[PDB]
């Protein structure tokens, strides 16, 4: 179903998702490579322990986008809702407000 | 104005290669989906143009039903770095949930 | 080309000096009982810059000290401080305080008894 | 005291882009080993993807070097492509010019590099297969217009020698490895098979006689030969989506040697495994061939490497540890890195494993 | 600390909360008025002097509610007047709190008729709404601006009537008396009436607000009102020092103020409080009853400038805090609209024009460059002046920036133009720029920063203490953390304000010091006013009098404790505290069980880094400014007699 | 005078300790990025054709 995962490539090991995991579940854990300041520490979801409660992902807490949700049909969601894509331009008026 | 459109962490809109099936035997079953998760697209030539231009960023998950290894063009001289075509490059997201407790 | 870096830095310092001089003329102030109004603003600007420059070069040199420090500095680091400290002490005797500060006569006030006998001049 | 001051810089690109800005300056007070000095040289290598559909990249190399009192120039320009995973095809032209002499050439050679063992038991066990034993055949067809008289004289001499000397195929080997090359070759694990001269032909062109020579040789590597073991890694034609440049040079006199290098080229980064990248395995042929010159003077190194990772990348391992970190730039300066620089400058092939990942 | 968030409350709830708070505040005003009753209406002696009433005694006597007259007669009358006005405030505050309860509970049913009016649709005051509004603001704050302007016009009119009749100050044009405040009360009526009508007929538009904007409108208006407070502080400082205000602020110096906590008539140890009490022991000063709070003359205390400084710094601190809070809450709104995606959909300059990250970077870089330049200039000037006055490196005061007065075109702002005023102006600009670095970071880099968009990270939670040691450390990167840093940076501009208004010589750290030429500034710079000692020696001189007061000494100790307690939470110690608190829990468990069979099942709580930063900044600010209160409440202690040359 | 210099310098040092001990490394890093970008932009605009250098920030350790 939900089957929330973490992209180890992008995790920064902040742990903002770990605190949301229910205390007994504790599926999310810390994996250390070395030299914490160099980014060795990372986040992993033990899929066996996960109970698809959505607390980790629905929190909107992942800064890197590593925390993803694979929908039952299958689609990776990096966020609960990404902002719409826009074609932007600076509206500078001609005469009155912001000329040129 | 570009960082505030879409996810602010991806300068180029990211497209995970979620589903691919060998049964259709054409590999058109490759079904790219953006990180937003609202468009189950396909690897069309326009998507190829976007990928080469750098507008998009196609990615692959490790934990999934296998997309196509050596059946969708693969470079294995180094660690595998799957490519739709040699000029393309599907950077595989690595996902170590099983190897670690 | 770092020539433009030094050009901009020296131009900025020169412009600071010129601005200080100009505003010193603008700001109406009685110069001093003796000192002039042409040199005093420049003395203040010299202090200003020398302070900023000394702090900047100290910061930069200590950064490059931390960058270049190695085991090969085994004798280069300690002895250098030694010499500088030595120089400092010598600079205290020959430049800053030239003597022991005896009286004008040269009586060498050196005990509290004679200090008491001195401070109460008739 | 014979100091050696060097400064290296490797700016990388994100994603799977193996592209890198490689800058490198060096100044050594030790005398060079060239029996003729001064020796100055400038080498440019510019490659562009000509026909990506067939994998063709046009690579042009210009060497301009003054030795003693003579200027020499070798230009080449060849479209090279991967015919297969083991065969490579090149069609190119070029010219050489030494003082009052010069001649152009056109070639259509093919290089077939094939290892001796492709066992999967090794590939799944050793994640870093440095040594790979192999054989690289070259079938070279080269044509030279004999505009000058000396070209014709040498063509006649070669015709006489090949058609009379029964030991030409092996003595040519110690001919065309001039001076210390024939030594360094053997010191790099490289063997050369007796060539076969498939034919000498005076197939005249439109503007004078043309000497056409087709000959096949093969060089074999015991794994230390990067031109064999790292075959696929030598030719990032797949990675080449834009022009790649290299501008190097060295000025050498009895006073010492100076070296400049500035390039933008792919193949710098390779995937070690599991989303982890790595600055490519150091080629060993340059190191062992340098050891033939680097062991002649006792030197002290002042070296500084500056690896500028892409925005958001961290180094997870460095064999000689990095001296300093500027949140994307990792600096190696002194310590074990200086020992490693003294080790490779003298011919060492020690590992300098930089592993980095996002 | 988020229970009364804007989202949690609707417009009627906010109306009711503000109304109930106005009523509570009216009760506080009555309390202060009663605290001001020196002599009771019944004859007996009354309350001593409190800063809470010495702050408003000038204004109260301006309105005739209080009197500076010193006889028991007419001071009894002033006390009766204060009691009457306090009772009026009490009852009106009761009514205001009743209305606030009704609005908060939405039970807007008339107790007499029972008709339940609608916040959305309501005729204002009856027929007046029909005449003017023609029907209420159907919705929208924009349609509410005009009605609020009309309400403020009616408030101005009512104050005019009250001062004309109740307090007996007729409307007279001349601006040297309270009478003008009546005149202008009518003027600003018509203005804020007419404009209201205009804004009722032609509403204004800033579409960022009006939509889901209790936080957004609150942020903008809080920043605006913080600048209003800063302007009010400047105006108060200028005006209260003008001659027209002297009858109400300068006449404080002629009075003697018995303030709680001031020196009390001491008694010997062998003292018995029976009858005359003389036989047992001797009190410190005779003619005053034992333990009585001894008189303090306003001339020495400088109560005129003390009260002026207290009011001015109250408004300045409140305004700076309001600016910082407005930028913070606006940053919270910005982050909300960035997360939900409305940021790109806003079509107003206040959001669109800074949409580009390039312009944000350029803005913050310009602010940072100006801050570097001005801070370096002022700090070089100050340290060089210190090097000169202390004669360090062989220097002397002649090399100091005594010549660097404000230009003749800018000396109008300053009574005695010297290098002190120059350093004041430039230090204020530099502190403003410093705090603006953080404020601009909140404004722009609320959801993503150029480092973070390069580093592939986004700021979501608006309170996350960090993202970890990744990239060498991500401490204090939320907008809340930037607000805390902005407050800790504005601490310094606010200090500069305090030290300037209390008479300090902020151009050098060691003015008035008994060393070298520190006491020569008055001769070389030709100063008229003898500024209180310099930045480092100002502590000493002001503590001469802080230490003389038991109450001010208690404040000193308490604020210092509060300040240094802040490091336990601000320092990078949270993990150490968590580990130690686990050890504390285990210690309590086993020690208690061994000592007492009862089990504990309780854990010592450790603040999160977010709460740690919140409490740490609160404590830092609290200690710092509870002590600035001592600086401003010791006395002005800046005399108009320059010190001669040291030699 | 000398004791006064020590007083001022020691207090300067002590309070500068707060810039690093406080939980502010992320703020200083995010701001040093702005310092780098400002240096590049200004060194390109009015200083001509000069852009380089990164402003270092001390790690939490
Ligand atoms: C005809 C020759 C072959 C070939 C032969 C080799 C060999 C052999 C080696 C490489 C190596 C590399 N080559 Mg190649 N290379 C070919 C075409 C290419 C193309 C291309 C798409 O056309 C590209 C992008 C590259 C790029 C690269 C990198 C993958 C790698 C160096 C990385 C490093 O950091 O360099 C740092 C670069 C610098 C230090 C600059 C060096 C500049 C000098 C001037 C070049 C060497 C000159 C040599 C000493 C003198 C020989 C002169 C001849 C006698 C005429 N080569 C052609 C087809 N290449 C090496 C590698 O690491 O393999 C894994 C290696 O072993
Ligand atoms: C400190 C620096 C900033 C500041 C920083 C923050 C931060 C940080 C936060 C808020 C939050 C809020 N702020 Mg604020 N804000 C400032 C100024 C203001 C002002 C103003 C005076 O004009 C207002 C109206 C607001 C309004 C608000 C609300 C929109 C919101 C929820 C408050 C509430 O429910 O808390 C409930 C608690 C309160 C009532 C305040 C605490 C005071 C207690 C209850 C008062 C009575 C007891 C006693 C007299 C004093 C306390 C100590 C005693 C020892 C018990 N802020 C100051 C100047 N503000 C929070 C929110 O959720 O943001 C979305 C939040 O996280
Ligand atoms: C002077 C004009 C100021 C202003 C001054 C204040 C002050 C001051 C306070 C508020 C409070 C509130 N303000 Mg306001 N407010 C302004 C404009 C706005 C606007 C708007 C423009 O539409 C909005 C939407 C708000 C929004 C709100 C709510 C968050 C809250 C009222 C709800 C209520 O009382 O909860 C029900 C809550 C209770 C009645 C409990 C109150 C408890 C105690 C008595 C007060 C707590 C806070 C603190 C001690 C006050 C500190 C002031 C400092 C001395 C500087 N403000 C401008 C910027 N507002 C109050 C609030 O709750 O702050 C957190 C509050 O105290
Ligand atoms: C101090 C009293 C409080 C207060 C307490 C009450 C009480 C109590 C009741 C209401 C009722 C109502 N309140 Mg009210 N309310 C206050 C301010 C407001 C404001 C505002 C202007 O910001 C709004 C939007 C409202 C909204 C509303 C209406 C929905 C409703 C009246 C319907 C109507 O047709 O009445 C026409 C008149 C109104 C719109 C009232 C406007 C507010 C006036 C100022 C209340 C004054 C009461 C006071 C005892 C008398 C003094 C009059 C002097 C001339 C000063 N109140 C004032 C400041 N409100 C009343 C009700 O339900 O009516 C059917 C009701 O009984
Ligand atoms: C000027 C009158 C008001 C004001 C009215 C508003 C309004 C109205 C809005 C904001 C909003 C915001 N305000 Mg404001 N605000 C003021 C003072 C400040 C100060 C300050 C310390 O001076 C700061 C740091 C902020 C900070 C902020 C942000 C939280 C937010 C904009 C984010 C953004 O993306 O901007 C993008 C960056 C800009 C648009 C930069 C350019 C500035 C604009 C064009 C106007 C001022 C410059 C002016 C032309 C200068 C030249 C002439 C001089 C007037 C002499 N305000 C004063 C008190 N503010 C918005 C918000 O969302 O509120 C919650 C909002 O709706
Ligand atoms: C008055 C000031 C202080 C204390 C009082 C105190 C008390 C205390 N501290 Mg502290 N602290 C600082 C100030 C004070 N820290 C500063 C300025 C820094 C900046 C570096 C700092 C830093 C760390 C780190 C990094 C760690 C700790 C701990 C830790 C404790 C848990 C157990 C213990 O130590 O008990 C030993 C400590 C005692 C029980 C102290 C005895 C009480 C006293 C006589 C009177 C209390 C007065 C009161 C505070 C005033 C108002 C109270 C009321 C009227 C509202 C613990 C009770 C840590 C632990 O949990 O591990 C042991 C840990 O890891 N800290
Ligand atoms: C004298 C003491 C201090 C400074 C000098 C300073 C300088 C500074 N700081 Mg600081 N700081 C504190 C003290 C000082 N912070 C405290 C006690 C706290 C505890 C809360 C604290 C905390 C934060 C946070 C949380 C952040 C920052 C920043 C940030 C800057 C970058 C942008 C800027 O302000 O440029 C504007 C340029 C100036 C501020 C530099 C002009 C220098 C002048 C002439 C004083 C010279 C000091 C001394 C004489 C040098 C010795 C030379 C020789 C003797 C060896 C930046 C230059 C941050 C940024 O990078 O954000 C954009 C950020 O996020 N901070
Ligand atoms: C505390 C002293 C300052 C030191 C602060 C350090 C600065 C950052 C240093 C990096 C910090 C760090 O972290 O790393 C240190 C790293 O160092 C090294 O690297 C280097 C880049 C080589 C260091 C050199 C940097 C530079 C050349 C030096 C510094 C820059 C300089 C030149 C600073 C001074 C600039 C100036 C003077 C600022 C001020 C200039 C602007 C002013 C005054 C405005 C005037 C107004 C005008 C227009 C008119 C005014 C007016 C008005 C308004 C009205 C009326 C009237 C009448 C008037 C006159 C190693 O390589 C690494 O190993 C090591 O790590
Ligand atoms: C204004 C701010 C509002 C409030 C914030 C103010 C606030 O939170 O304080 C700041 C800070 C509390 O932060 P912590 O999260 O570290 O508190 C954990 C506590 O349980 C102490 O370990 O206090 C200090 O650490 C200094 C004072 C602690 C002194 C209390 C002593 C506690 C005794 C516990 C038992 C010790 C015996 C040891 C048994 C083994
Ligand atoms: C500007 C020159 C940029 C500098 C420039 O272009 O680069 C020069 C220098 C570093 O640049 P690099 O030397 O590394 O660049 C190498 C190139 O110059 C070689 O082409 O700038 C620094 O980063 C200095 C760091 C402290 C610099 C502090 C500057 C603060 C000044 C702020 C005051 C401005 C006054 C205006 C306010 C009124
Ligand atoms: S869905 Fe719930 S149980 Fe599963 S990892 Fe997320 S927080 Fe833990
Ligand atoms: S030191 Fe504390 S605040 Fe800073 S990154 Fe680590 S956990 Fe976060
Ligand atoms: Ca005072």
UniProtKB/Swiss-Prot annotation, chain B:
A GO biological-process term: photosynthesis
Residues forming coiled coils: none
Keywords noted in UniProt: Electron transport, Photosynthesis, Reaction center, Transport
Superkingdom of source: Bacteria
Complex and partners: Component of the P840 reaction center.
The protein's name in its UniProt record: P840 reaction center 17 kDa protein
UniProtKB/Swiss-Prot annotation, chain C:
Modified how: Binds 1 heme group per subunit.
Major localisation: membrane
Lineage: superkingdom: Bacteria
Compartment list: Cell inner membrane
A GO molecular-function annotation: metal ion binding
Bilayer-crossing regions: 6-26, 45-65, 72-92
Quaternary structure annotation from Swiss-Prot or TrEMBL: Monomer. Component of the photosynthetic reaction center composed of protein subunits PscA, PscC, PscB and PscD. The reaction center interacts with FmoA (which forms the Fenna-Matthews-Olson (FMO) complex). The reaction center/FmoA complex has two PscA subunits, one PscB and one PscD subunit, probably two FmoA complexes and at least one PscC subunit.
Protein name as catalogued: Cytochrome c
Organism name: Chlorobaculum tepidum (strain ATCC 49652 / DSM 12025 / NBRC 103806 / TLS) (Chlorobium tepidum)
Parent-protein start and end of this portion: 5 to 126 of 206
UniProtKB/Swiss-Prot annotation, chain D:
InterPro entries with a match to the protein in the record: BChl_A, Chl_A_sf
UniProt binding sites for bacteriochlorophyll a 4: 282
Keywords recorded for this protein, A-Z: Bacteriochlorophyll, Chlorophyll, Chromophore, Electron transport, Magnesium, Metal-binding, Photosynthesis, Reaction center, Transport
Disulfide bonds: none
SUPFAM superfamilies according to UniProt: Bacteriochlorophyll A protein
Biological role stated in the UniProt entry: Intermediary in the transfer of excitation energy from the chlorophyll to the reaction centers.
Stated name of the protein: Bacteriochlorophyll a protein
Organism: Chlorobaculum tepidum (strain ATCC 49652 / DSM 12025 / NBRC 103806 / TLS)
Lineage: Bacteria, Pseudomonadati, Chlorobiota, Chlorobiia, Chlorobiales
């Amino acid at each position: 179903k939900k089957h929330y995962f973490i992209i180890e490539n992008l995790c920064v090991g902040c742990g903002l998702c770990l605190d949301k995991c229910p205390p007994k579940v504790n599926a999310i854990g810390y994996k250390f490579y070395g030299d914490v300041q160099e980014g060795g520490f990372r986040c992993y979801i033990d899929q066996a322990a996960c109970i698809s409660c959505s607390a980790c992902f629905s929190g909107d807490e992942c800064p890197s986008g590593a925390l993803i949700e694979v929908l039952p049909d299958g689609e990776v969601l990096d966020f609960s809702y990404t902002p719409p894509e826009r074609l932007d331009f600076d509206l500078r008026f001609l005469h009155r407000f912001h000329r040129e | 104005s570009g960082p505030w459109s879409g996810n602010a962490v991806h300068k180029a809109e990211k497209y995970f290669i979620t589903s691919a099936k060998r049964d259709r035997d054409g590999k058109l079953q490759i079904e790219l989906v953006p990180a937003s998760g609202r468009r189950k697209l396909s690897p069309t030539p326009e998507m190829i143009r976007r990928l080469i231009d750098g507008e998009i960023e196609i990615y692959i998950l490790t934990t999934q039903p296998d997309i196509a290894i050596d059946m969708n063009k693969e470079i294995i001289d180094m660690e595998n770095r799957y490519v739709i075509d040699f000029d393309k490059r599907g950077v595989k997201w690595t996902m170590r949930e099983i190897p670690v407790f | 080309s770092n020539g433009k870096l030094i050009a901009l830095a020296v131009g900025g310092a020169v412009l600071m000096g010129a601005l200080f001089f100009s505003v010193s003329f603008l700001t109406g102030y009685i110069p001093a009982p003796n000192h002039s109004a042409i040199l005093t603003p420049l003395r203040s600007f010299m202090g200003w810059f020398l302070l900023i420059f000394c702090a900047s070069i100290i910061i930069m040199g200590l950064g490059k000290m931390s960058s270049a420090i190695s085991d090969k500095w085994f004798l280069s680091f300690p002895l250098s401080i030694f010499v500088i400290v030595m120089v400092m002490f010598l600079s205290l005797r020959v430049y800053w305080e030239k003597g022991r500060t005896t009286t004008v006569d040269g009586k060498y006030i050196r005990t509290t008894a004679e200090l008491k006998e001195f401070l109460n001049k008739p | 005291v014979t100091t050696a001051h060097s400064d290296y810089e490797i700016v990388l690109e994100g994603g799977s882009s193996s592209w890198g800005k490689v800058k490198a300056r060096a100044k050594v007070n030790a005398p060079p080993a060239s029996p003729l000095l001064p020796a100055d040289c400038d080498v440019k290598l510019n490659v562009k993807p000509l026909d990506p559909a067939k994998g063709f990249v046009r690579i042009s190399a210009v060497f301009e070097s003054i030795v003693d009192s003579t200027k020499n120039k070798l230009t080449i320009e060849a479209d090279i492509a991967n015919e297969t995973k083991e065969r490579r095809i090149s069609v190119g032209e070029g010219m050489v010019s030494v003082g009052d002499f010069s001649h152009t050439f056109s070639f259509e050679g093919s290089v077939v590099n094939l290892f001796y063992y492709r066992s999967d038991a090794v590939r799944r066990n050793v994640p870093n297969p440095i040594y790979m034993q192999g054989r690289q055949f070259h079938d070279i067809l080269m044509k030279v217009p004999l505009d000058n008289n000396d070209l014709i004289d040498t063509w006649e001499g070669t015709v006489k020698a090949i058609g009379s000397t029964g030991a030409f195929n092996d003595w040519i080997r110690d001919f065309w490895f001039i001076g210390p090359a024939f030594t360094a070759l053997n010191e790099g694990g490289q063997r050369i098979s007796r060539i076969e001269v498939n034919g000498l032909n005076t197939e005249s062109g439109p503007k004078g006689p043309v000497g056409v020579s087709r000959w096949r040789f093969s060089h074999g590597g015991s794994g230390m030969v990067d031109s064999i073991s790292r075959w696929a890694e030598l030719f990032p034609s797949d990675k080449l989506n834009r022009p790649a440049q290299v501008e190097a040079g060295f000025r050498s006199d009895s006073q010492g040697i100076e070296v400049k290098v500035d390039g933008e080229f792919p193949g710098v980064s390779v995937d070690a495994g599991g989303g982890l990248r790595r600055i490519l395995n150091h080629p060993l042929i340059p190191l062992v061939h340098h050891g033939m010159v680097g062991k002649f003077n006792n030197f002290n190194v002042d070296a500084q490497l500056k690896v500028v990772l892409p925005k958001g990348y961290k180094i997870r391992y460095a064999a000689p540890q990095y001296r300093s970190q500027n949140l994307e730039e990792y600096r190696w300066s002194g310590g074990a890195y200086a020992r490693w620089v003294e080790h490779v400058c003298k011919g060492g092939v020690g590992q300098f494993e930089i592993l980095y990942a996002q | 600390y988020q229970i009364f968030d804007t989202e949690k409350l609707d417009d009627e709830q906010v109306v009711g909360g503000h109304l109930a708070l106005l009523g509570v505040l009216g009760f506080i005003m009555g309390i202060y008025y009663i605290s001001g009753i020196q002599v009771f209406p019944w004859g007996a002696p009354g309350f001593h002097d409190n800063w809470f009433y010495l702050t408003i005694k000038p204004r109260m006597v301006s309105l005739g509610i209080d009197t500076y007259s010193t006889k028991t007669a007419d001071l009894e009358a002033a006390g009766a007047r204060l009691l009457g006005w306090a009772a009026f405030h009490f009852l009106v505050g009761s009514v205001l709190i009743f209305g606030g309860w009704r609005h908060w509970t939405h039970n807007l049913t008339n107790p007499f008729t029972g008709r339940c009016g609608n916040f959305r649709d309501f005729r204002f005051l009856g027929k007046f709404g029909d005449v003017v509004f023609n029907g209420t603001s159907a919705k929208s704050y924009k349609e509410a601006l005009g009605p609020h302007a009309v309400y403020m016009s009616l408030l101005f009119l009512g104050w005019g009537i009250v001062m004309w009749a109740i307090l007996g100050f007729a409307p007279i044009p001349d601006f040297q008396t309270i009478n003008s405040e009546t005149f202008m009360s009518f003027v600003f009526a018509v203005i804020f009436f007419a404009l209201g009508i205009y804004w009722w007929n032609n509403p204004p538009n800033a579409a960022i607000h009006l939509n889901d904007d209790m936080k957004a409108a609150f942020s903008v208006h809080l920043t605006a009102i913080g600048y209003i407070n800063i302007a009010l502080g400047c105006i108060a400082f200028v005006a209260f020092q003008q001659p027209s205000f002297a009858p109400y602020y300068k006449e404080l110096d002629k009075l003697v103020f018995y303030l709680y906590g001031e020196p009390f008539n001491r008694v010997s140890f062998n003292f018995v409080e029976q009858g005359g009490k003389v036989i047992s022991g001797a009190k410190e000063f005779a003619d005053f009853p034992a333990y009585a709070i001894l008189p303090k003359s306003g001339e020495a205390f400088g109560m005129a400038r003390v009260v002026t400084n207290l009011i001015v710094f109250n408004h300045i601190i409140c305004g700076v805090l309001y600016v910082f809070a407005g930028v913070y809450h606006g940053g919270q709104y910005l982050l909300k609209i960035q997360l939900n995606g409305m940021y790109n959909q806003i079509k107003s300059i206040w959001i669109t024009k800074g949409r580009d990250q390039e312009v944000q970077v350029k803005i913050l870089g310009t602010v940072m460059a100006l801050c570097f330049a001005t801070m370096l200039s002022v700090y070089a000037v100050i340290v060089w002046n210190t090097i000169c006055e202390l004669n360090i490196f062989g220097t002397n005061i002649t090399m100091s920036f005594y010549w660097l007065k404000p230009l003749p075109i800018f000396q109008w702002m300053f009574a005695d133009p010297s290098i002190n005023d120059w350093v004041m102006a430039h230090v204020i600009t530099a502190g403003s720029l410093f705090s603006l670095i953080a404020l601009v970071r909140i404004a722009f880099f609320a959801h993503t920063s150029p480092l973070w968009d390069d580093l592939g990270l986004k700021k979501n939670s608006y309170s996350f203490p960090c993202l970890g040691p990744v990239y060498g450390g991500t401490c204090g990167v939320s907008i809340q953390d930037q607000l805390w840093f902005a407050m800790l940076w504005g601490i310094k501009g606010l200090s500069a304000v305090c030290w300037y208004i209390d008479g300090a010589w902020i151009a050098s750290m060691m003015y008035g010091v008994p060393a070298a030429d520190a006491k020569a500034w008055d001769s070389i710079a030709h100063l008229h006013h003898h500024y209180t000692s310099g930045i480092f020696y100002y502590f000493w001189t002001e503590t001469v009098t802080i230490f003389s007061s038991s109450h001010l000494s208690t404040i000193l100790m308490i604020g210092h404790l509060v300040w240094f307690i802040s490091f336990a939470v601000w320092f990078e110690d949270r993990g150490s505290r968590l580990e130690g608190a686990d050890i504390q829990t285990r210690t309590i468990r086993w020690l208690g069980k061994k000592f007492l069979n009862r089990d504990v099942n309780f854990r010592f709580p450790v603040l999160t880094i977010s709460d740690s930063k919140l409490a740490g900044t609160f404590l830092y600010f609290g200690g710092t400014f509870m002590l600035v209160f001592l600086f401003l409440a010791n006395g002005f202690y800046q005399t108009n007699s320059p010190l001669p040359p040291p030699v």
